Amino acid sequence: EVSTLNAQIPELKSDLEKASALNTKIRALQGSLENMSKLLKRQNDILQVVSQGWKYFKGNFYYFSLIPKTWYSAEQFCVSRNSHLTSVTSESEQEFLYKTAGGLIYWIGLTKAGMEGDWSWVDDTPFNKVQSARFWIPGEPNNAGNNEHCGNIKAPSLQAWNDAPCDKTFLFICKRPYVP
Amino acid sequence: EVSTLNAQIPELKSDLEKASALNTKIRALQGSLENMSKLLKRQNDILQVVSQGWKYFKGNFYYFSLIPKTWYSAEQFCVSRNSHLTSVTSESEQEFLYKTAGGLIYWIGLTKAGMEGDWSWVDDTPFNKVQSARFWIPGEPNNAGNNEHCGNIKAPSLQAWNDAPCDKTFLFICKRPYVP
Amino acid sequence: EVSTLNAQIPELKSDLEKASALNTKIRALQGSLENMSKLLKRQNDILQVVSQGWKYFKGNFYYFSLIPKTWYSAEQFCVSRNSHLTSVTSESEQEFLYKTAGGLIYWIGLTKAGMEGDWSWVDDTPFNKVQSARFWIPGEPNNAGNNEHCGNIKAPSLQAWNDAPCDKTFLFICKRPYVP
Amino acid sequence: EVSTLNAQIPELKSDLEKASALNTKIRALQGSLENMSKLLKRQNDILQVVSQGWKYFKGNFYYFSLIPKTWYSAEQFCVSRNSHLTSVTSESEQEFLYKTAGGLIYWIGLTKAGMEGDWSWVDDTPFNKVQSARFWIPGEPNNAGNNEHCGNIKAPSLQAWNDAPCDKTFLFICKRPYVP
Amino acid sequence: EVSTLNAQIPELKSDLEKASALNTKIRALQGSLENMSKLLKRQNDILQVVSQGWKYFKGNFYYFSLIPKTWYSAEQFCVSRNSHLTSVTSESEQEFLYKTAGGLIYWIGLTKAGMEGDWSWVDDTPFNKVQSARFWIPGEPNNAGNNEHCGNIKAPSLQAWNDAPCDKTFLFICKRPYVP
Amino acid sequence: EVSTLNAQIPELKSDLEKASALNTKIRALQGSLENMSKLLKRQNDILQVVSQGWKYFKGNFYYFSLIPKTWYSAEQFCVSRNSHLTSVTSESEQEFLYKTAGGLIYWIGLTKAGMEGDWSWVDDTPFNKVQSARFWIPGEPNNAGNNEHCGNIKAPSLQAWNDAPCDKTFLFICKRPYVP
């Protein structure tokens, strides 16, 4: 009866760490498969809008228009595309916008509003004077002829924003935030 | 010997139920892994065609041409691209076509046939008059000048189809179904 | 005690074989999950460049320019985009280039060097005379006016290369290899 | 009869020439007398308002208030005195205003208005950016707290204008043009 | 002798007409110069008192004190300045007084006398109840505490007179008539 | 010929007599008009300085400060106004100063100089101690605390001068002579 005990008790160990290891593997595998499922569904959601002629950058779909429209008409078209004239909130966003622009001028959300005519984004994004000055073309805004109250990206460089009358047609970047 | 049995028999229940759980987890993890492998290979199949200047929608690849050509010349080019002039079979197809068109005009598979000029699709897609009724521009088809026997999408709206002579150049949407 | 042995020894076979099966599962699953993780990260690396207006083919990103520039100006722009004028090294590359070109003309890395004007690639790619002859338009190179010392793809066919002076403006295909 | 002729003809010369001199005297003395008449009327008109505690400068009466009022209330009091918060249209105007101020702060016609919040004069005097540039205290306007939309003379120097909220009580310079 | 007579008679007539006209000039010019000399003398008389910090109105000199005094002390100071506390005999005088006051309160010649306490002027000016009725502040005189027996100009309006005990200090308007 | 002579002789006599009278009146009128023109020029010169809040007395312009300053700071301000701290050269000037002061305190040009500290005027006016003694407040100068080396006018009387330390802030009378 000694040999059977010296066989059973190590069986007790072996199956206890066996069950413990199986539990650890099941929990870790469940977590990892849930994470990869989220990753794949997010990627699939990414793919479709980009496949329909839209660009993507930092959680925003940007449609670089094939047809030119005026600042407010461009905003209307972007709204019809459930979007707005692109509002730049960072260095990287401006960089991507003027790089994908390929040298083309795109109306953006910049417009003079308020009692002081301060600049603002059409999509109600806050206008950071300090940050915006770095994105503005040198000498701009100058309000040439006192009629330059809308902004557009012209230069393929960080300082791409020029002020100009809202009334004239341009290509435009329709911006709508990514949502899962 | 009683303690040995009271140790052996619960070991029987434990290892039996745990091997059953092993069977369950093996089968579930397997089915999920071939499922995700199929999803991965399908998305890989999807991505390359889009990466080469093509658009995709509901299992069909649509090329919105950068060069305008006539109706039958566009059909020839699409055939050379293993495709055809896009035939519209659903609300979603027409919507996607005119939205990705971005206001541009694209030849489609609409063409008259026979002595009475019944409309039909070039890619042998059946043409349902009642179903295709609301896809036509109002007043169209009118066969203006009695020479309007091919269809093209102009308006960024559901009523975008217009009949017009087949002999003039326009942009075109080459359509070939996605095949894995 | 005989029944105890006849019950516990098969427990030995069962637990050893199931531990071996668990080992097989762990190793195979670990290898497969590492492989699919690598595939996922490579796919993520691929997708963003194409999502920003670029094309992709066999580990090389090709930007088909929206703005035309001369041979050396196009090379400068491509370098600014961390790339070069595309050098064609295979049948597949030439085919993809003239197919995604959509009938458009693009400057490539072809250039003459030295007093004898031996042809070569700008990106230091070796120039295969035998292979390149199959890619050159018939009658080309001809050095029309003794001034045609660069190369561009015009025809949507295998024999797409025509020689031309380096100083004339054309669209261009910026080429940079895919790096993980 | 010779002597009477030689006496009477020079009588003709003398009385004719002195009648001419009489005409010259009449015209000159007249012109001078009504000229000094208008001058005397103008000085009598000038003296009366000055005698009533008002100051005078280049055809404008400026009442340097003995009681402080807010910008809008100061304008109300000035209007009640058939005047307005003083505008500044010249170097001499600003100089006289801050010199007669004697170091005291006086509300002036400066106020932000219009879609761009541009500065303007309460008395409807046109406001020139370039002209009024040097009349502002250095660093002003700064719109401290984004609430400084009226102007007052503080410094006993050319750069006397500081922007401030219109709601603060200050001495004020009532301005009304001299009218004959 | 005929010609000399036909020259002499017009000589006499012209000499007589010229002499009469010169008499007209002499008399008219003498009268005008004497009148303007008197006016200039009066202007010189007027200007000197005003130049010494005094105000002037319709033949009276009014000193608006910079230091407050009690009613009787103010009267003593005015007497020392060869004047008296100002008495108001017309609407224009009251208007000038309160307008030059600029909202400030000034002791005036109002004082009660006799066992019934009838009001009167300190400078022996007759007191018109009917006229003074419209110069008192509405509700005044009320003789608050039965101790209000002196008058001061308070309001920036015609009804500026307020009654108060004579023992408190106010600014004061010393009044002395203009005499050539 | 008798009658014509008895008419000619009175003609000559009257013409000569009234010609002499015209000469006399011309000279007298010219002198009077030149004198009154000079007087009017002087009056126009006088009026402007007084019109800007300044006082005048016997060829000197005195500014009674609305803001107080220390003795040396008052002198600096007076110099900046092209003037100096007022010096007294006559009894009438002292009378005018303390009467226009209206009981207020004003710094004057009295200051000690040299190792014996003899008194003198800041504007280099000679010190008439014989006349100055009649203008000092009784008991003054006393040099209280051996630190009283400047002069101030406080008392509304001829004896208005008091010695006092130069470092404290009083009102001041800026004095500058009238020059045509």
Numbering used by the authors:
A (entry chain E), B (entry chain F), C (entry chain D), D (entry chain A), E (entry chain B), F (entry chain C): 146 to 325
Reproduce the article's own wording on this structure.
Langerin is a type II transmembrane protein that is composed of a cytoplasmic tail, coiled-coil neck region, and carbohydrate recognition domain (CRD). Through the coiled-coil neck region, langerin forms a trimer, which is functionally important for oligosaccharide binding. The calcium-dependent carbohydrate-binding capacity of langerin CRD is essential for the formation of Birbeck granules because the removal of calcium ions causes them to unzip and disintegrate.
To purify these Birbeck granules, we expressed SNAP-tagged human langerin in 293T cells, biotinylated the tag by incubation with benzylguanine-biotin, and immunoprecipitated the Birbeck granules using streptavidin agarose. We then performed a two-body refinement to visualize the spatial relationship between the two opposing langerin trimers. An in-depth analysis of the interaction region between the two CRDs revealed that the interaction is mediated by a loop at residues 258–263, which is highly flexible in the crystal structure. The interaction between the two CRDs appears to be maintained by docking the loops of two langerin molecules into each other’s lateral cleft, which constitutes the secondary carbohydrate-binding site. The interaction between the two CRDs is flexible because the first eigenvector of the multi-body analysis represents an approximately 30° tilting motion with the loop as the fulcrum. The docked loop 258–263 may provide additional interactions with the hydroxyl group of mannose via Glu261 and Asp263, thus increasing the affinity of the secondary binding site when two langerin trimers form a complex. To investigate the importance of loop 258–263 in the biogenesis of Birbeck granules, we mutated three residues in the loop: Met260Ala, Glu261Arg, and Asp263Lys, and generated three mutated langerin constructs, each carrying one (MRGD), two (MRGK), or three mutations (ARGK). In contrast, the internalization of the pseudovirus was significantly inhibited by the ARGK mutation. These results suggest that disruption of Birbeck granule formation by the mutation of loop 258–263 inhibited the internalization of HIV pseudovirus.
